[PDB]
Amino acid sequence: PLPVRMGYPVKKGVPMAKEGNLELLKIPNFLHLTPVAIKKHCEALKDFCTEWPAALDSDEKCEKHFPIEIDSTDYVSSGPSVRNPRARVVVLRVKLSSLNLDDHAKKKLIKLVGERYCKTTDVLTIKTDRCPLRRQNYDYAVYLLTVLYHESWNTEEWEKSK
Amino acid sequence: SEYAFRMSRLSARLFGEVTRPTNSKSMKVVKLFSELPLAKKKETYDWYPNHHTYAELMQTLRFLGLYRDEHQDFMDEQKRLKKLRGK
Amino acid sequence: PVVTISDEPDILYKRLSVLVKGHDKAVLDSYEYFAVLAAKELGISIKVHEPPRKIERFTLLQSVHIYKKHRVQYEMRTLYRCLELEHLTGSTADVYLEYIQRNLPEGVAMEVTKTQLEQLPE
Amino acid sequence: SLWDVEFAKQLATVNEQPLQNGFEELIQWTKEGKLWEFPINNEAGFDDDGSEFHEHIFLEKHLESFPKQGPIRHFMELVTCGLSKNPYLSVKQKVEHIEWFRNYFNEK
Amino acid sequence: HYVDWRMWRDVKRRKMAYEYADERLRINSLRKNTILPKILQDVADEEIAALPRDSCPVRIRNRCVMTSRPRGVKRRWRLSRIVFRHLADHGQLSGIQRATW
Amino acid sequence: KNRAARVRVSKGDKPVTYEEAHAPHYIAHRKGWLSLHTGNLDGEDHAAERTVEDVFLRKFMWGTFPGCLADQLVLKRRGNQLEICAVVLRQLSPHKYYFLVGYSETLLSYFYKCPVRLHLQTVPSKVVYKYL
C-alpha cells in the first residue's frame, strides 16, 4: 500500500512508475517487519537472559581464569545446502603464562613445540585439528596437553644439555 | 643437530608422528596418496552437467505442457525443412 | 523459556566476533544498522568501525572479440562491518543469530560470526 | 480395527497443527526439514562419524611394521601423519587406506 | 545431450580421469619420485605409457557453458570473461560495475 | 558507442522496460542488480554453483509462464527461503493462476529441498525508463 516512486528521471519531470518497480524488487527487500514489528519481535526475544561474569576485560584476567580459548563458531550457509565445511575450526590457544607451574618443564616445552612460546605472553596455540570434528578435537588436545604435562613433571636425563 | 634429532625422535615416540628426518620430497607423495590428487577437484565432474537426466526432465516437462523449448523446436523444424529439400 | 529448562552447567562463551561481507554499500549499511539496533535493544556494549577493504580486481578485456588498447575491469565497492559482541553468553548470541538469519539480506551482507570459549584446562 | 484406523487418520488430519496461517506454514516447513535447522549451526549434517578423541591419531600400534631395515616404515609413518593431519577422513577410511598401502607395498 | 561438441569432449575427459581414480592416483603419486624403490615407479610409467587416451588425469582446461571457450576462464564462476561480461551487462550480477575506484 | 543494453532514440511511444534501456557503464549506477545471490561474494567463496543454480531457476521460471516474462527474476536467499519476484502479466483467470502457482511451489519445494514461492506483478504499468 506504499505507492513509492522509484526510477531515474527522463529529462525534467518525475521518476517513472508508481507501484512495484524493478528497482524496488532489486532492493534486498526489508519492507517486512516495520519498527513497530521490530519492537514486537524484540519484546518476543526478551527471553533468554543468562547472566555473564564480570571477570575484567583487557584480555588478561579472562585468560588468567581460564587460559584455554577454543573457538566454536556457527557460520551461515548459502544456497539450499546446509553442509558448510567450516564448523570444524578449533585451536587450543592456552596461555602458558597463566599456568606458571613448570619447574623443569620450561626447557622441555620450549623445544617440544616449534612455532610457539612467545616473550610477553606465552601463547601456546597448538592448532589441534586432526579429527573431523570440533568438541572431540578439543578433548583430544586437552588430553594430549595433560599427558605432556605429566611426562614433563619427570623430565628426561639428557634434557638439561641443550 | 644431533640433540635436535634425538629430541624430535623422542617427541615422535611420545606424540606418535614421523621419527627420523629425511628428504622433504615425501610430502607430495603423501598428499597424492591420501589427499586429493588432481583430477578429483571440486570443480571437475560438476564443471559440466551431464545434461542427460536434465534433458529427459525438460522433455517430460514439455510433454506435460508446462515448459518451452524454442531453440530445439526451431532446429527440428529447420532439419525437417532441409530433409524435405534434401535428401 | 520454551527450551526445556535444564540444570547442567553451560559453556563459558567470550567475544562473539562477527564480520559482515558483501558488495553493495547501502545493503551493508542497513544490515549493520539493524544489527546495532538489535544489540542495543538487547543491552550489549560493543564497538563498530570499518576495517580495510578486500578487493581482488580480476582481469578481463573491454570487448569480446579483439581489443587491447582499450581495457576495462569489474571491481566492487564492498565494505565490512565487524559487529563483534564483547563478552556474553552463548544462548543469547545463538538466539540473536537465529533471529538474524530468519530474514538475512540475500547475497550481499553475509556475516561470519565467531565465538571464543574457555573451559577448564588439565 | 477399522474404526481405530479411521480415528487415527482423523486425529492425524485434524489435531495435527494445520495451516490456515503463515506462522503455521512456517512451523510446517521447520518440522518437515524444508527450512534449515535455525540457527544455522552447521550441525544438521557434515558429521563425518565420530572419533572419541582417541582413534584418528593413535596409529602407532596399528602399523604392521616391516622388519626395520629400510625407509618403508618411515614412509608408512609419514602417510599416517598426513592422514592424521587431514580432517576429511574417518577411522574406517584410514584403516582401509593403510591396509591397501601395506598390501600394495609388501605383498610379495 | 549437448549442443556443441567441445563441451562433450571436456565432460568425457574429466569423467574418465575421475572414474579411474586409483590407477592415476597411484601413477601420479609414485612416478616422479627420488625416494623409495624404482620398481613401482617403472611399473607406473609402463602403465601410463601403455594405456590408451581418455584416462590420463592431465585433461583439465577451464571452459564455459554458454560458449565453451577455453581462452580466459576462471574457476570461481566456471565461465569465461565474455559470459561474465554478458551477464554483468544485463545487471544480473551483484557487486559488478565499472572500475570507478 | 556501446549498446550493451540500451536503445537509442527512435520514435516516442514504443515498448521498452527498465532492463531494456541501460548502458554498460551504469550497471550499478543508474541500474540495480537483478540477482542478489550468494555467489559473487567476497571474501566468501562458492560462486560457480550458485550462479548455475540461479540461471537454472530463472530459465525454469521463464519457461513456466508462456509469454509473460519480459525481464528476469530477482532471486533472494534468506538462508533457506527462495523468494521469486517475477514480472508476470495478467493472463486469464485466477483459478489457473492458483493451480499453476501451487503446483510449481510444491514441485520446487520437494525437488530443491528448500521452500519456493512466487508472486505475480499485478501492475497496470510497466517499469518504462526511456520514452524512446
Curated annotation (Swiss-Prot), chain A:
The alphabetized UniProt keywords are:
Coiled coil, Mitochondrion, Ribonucleoprotein, Ribosomal protein, Transit peptide
Do the record's keywords include Nucleotide-binding?
A: no
Enumerate the Gene Ontology biological process terms. Answer: mitochondrial translation
Query: Where does the protein end up?
Result: Mitochondrion
Q: Which GO terms describe its cellular component?
A: cytosol; mitochondrial inner membrane; mitochondrial small ribosomal subunit; mitochondrion
Annotated GO molecular function terms are: RNA binding; structural constituent of ribosome
**Does the entry feature the keyword Coiled coil, yes or no?**
yes
The record's comment on protein family reads: Belongs to the mitochondrion-specific ribosomal protein mS35 family.
Assembly behavior: Component of the mitochondrial small ribosomal subunit (mt-SSU). Mature mammalian 55S mitochondrial ribosomes consist of a small (28S) and a large (39S) subunit. The 28S small subunit contains a 12S ribosomal RNA (12S mt-rRNA) and 30 different proteins. The 39S large subunit contains a 16S rRNA (16S mt-rRNA), a copy of mitochondrial valine transfer RNA (mt-tRNA(Val)), which plays an integral structural role, and 52 different proteins.
Q: What is this protein called?
A: Small ribosomal subunit protein mS35
Q: What is the lineage of its organism?
A: Eukaryota, Metazoa, Chordata, Craniata, Vertebrata
Question: Which gene codes for it?
Answer: MRPS35
Instruction: Report where the shown chain sits in the full-length sequence: first residue, last residue, total length.
Output: 82 to 243 of 323
UniProtKB/Swiss-Prot annotation, chain D:
Please give the chief subcellular localization of this protein: mitochondrion
The highest taxon in the source lineage is Eukaryota
Indicate whether Transit peptide appears among the record's keywords.
yes
Q: Which GO terms describe its molecular function?
A: protein domain specific binding; RNA binding; structural constituent of ribosome
Subcellular localization: Mitochondrion
Q: Which UniProt keywords apply?
A: Mitochondrion, Ribonucleoprotein, Ribosomal protein, Transit peptide
The GO annotation for biological process reads: mitochondrial translation
Into which family does the record put it? Belongs to the mitochondrion-specific ribosomal protein mS31 family.
Q: How does it assemble?
A: Component of the mitochondrial small ribosomal subunit (mt-SSU). Mature mammalian 55S mitochondrial ribosomes consist of a small (28S) and a large (39S) subunit. The 28S small subunit contains a 12S ribosomal RNA (12S mt-rRNA) and 30 different proteins. The 39S large subunit contains a 16S rRNA (16S mt-rRNA), a copy of mitochondrial valine transfer RNA (mt-tRNA(Val)), which plays an integral structural role, and 52 different proteins.
Name recorded for this polypeptide: Small ribosomal subunit protein mS31
| Organism of provenance | Homo sapiens (Human)
- What gene name is given for the protein in this entry? MRPS31
**What part of the entire protein does this chain span?**
276 to 383 of 395
From Swiss-Prot, chain E:
Which parts of the chain span the membrane according to its record? none
> What broad class describes the main subcellular location of this protein?
mitochondrion
Q: What does UniProt give as GO cellular component?
A: mitochondrial inner membrane; mitochondrial ribosome; mitochondrial small ribosomal subunit; mitochondrion; nuclear membrane
Keywords, comma-separated and alphabetical: Disease variant, Mitochondrion, Primary mitochondrial disease, Ribonucleoprotein, Ribosomal protein
In the record, what terms sit under GO molecular function? Answer: RNA binding; structural constituent of ribosome
GO terms in the biological process aspect are: mitochondrial translation; translation
UniProt-annotated location(s): Mitochondrion
What disorder is listed for this protein? Combined oxidative phosphorylation deficiency 38: An autosomal recessive disorder due to mitochondrial dysfunction and characterized by perinatal hypertrophic cardiomyopathy, growth retardation, muscle hypotonia, elevated lactate, dysmorphy and intellectual disability.
Please give the subunit comment from the record: Component of the mitochondrial small ribosomal subunit (mt-SSU). Mature mammalian 55S mitochondrial ribosomes consist of a small (28S) and a large (39S) subunit. The 28S small subunit contains a 12S ribosomal RNA (12S mt-rRNA) and 30 different proteins. The 39S large subunit contains a 16S rRNA (16S mt-rRNA), a copy of mitochondrial valine transfer RNA (mt-tRNA(Val)), which plays an integral structural role, and 52 different proteins. Interacts with LIAT1.
Per the record, the similarity remark reads: Belongs to the universal ribosomal protein uS14 family.
User: What is this protein's name?
Assistant: Small ribosomal subunit protein uS14m
Q: What is the originating organism of this protein?
A: Homo sapiens (Human)
Curated annotation (Swiss-Prot), chain F:
Q: Could you tell me the superkingdom of the organism this chain comes from?
A: Eukaryota
List, in alphabetical order, the Gene Ontology terms for molecular function in this entry: RNA binding; structural constituent of ribosome
One of its GO biological process terms is: mitochondrial translation
| UniProt keyword S-adenosyl-L-methionine present | no
| Key word Transit peptide present | yes
Q: Which GO terms describe its cellular component?
A: mitochondrial inner membrane; mitochondrial small ribosomal subunit; mitochondrion
Q: Where in the cell is it found?
A: Mitochondrion
Keywords from the UniProt entry: Mitochondrion, Ribonucleoprotein, Ribosomal protein, Transit peptide
SUBUNIT field: Component of the mitochondrial small ribosomal subunit (mt-SSU). Mature mammalian 55S mitochondrial ribosomes consist of a small (28S) and a large (39S) subunit. The 28S small subunit contains a 12S ribosomal RNA (12S mt-rRNA) and 30 different proteins. The 39S large subunit contains a 16S rRNA (16S mt-rRNA), a copy of mitochondrial valine transfer RNA (mt-tRNA(Val)), which plays an integral structural role, and 52 different proteins.
Q: Can you tell me which family this protein belongs to?
A: Belongs to the universal ribosomal protein uS3 family.
What is this protein identified as?
Answer: Small ribosomal subunit protein uS3m
| Organism from which the protein derives | Homo sapiens
Q: Which section of the whole protein is represented?
A: 36 to 167 of 167
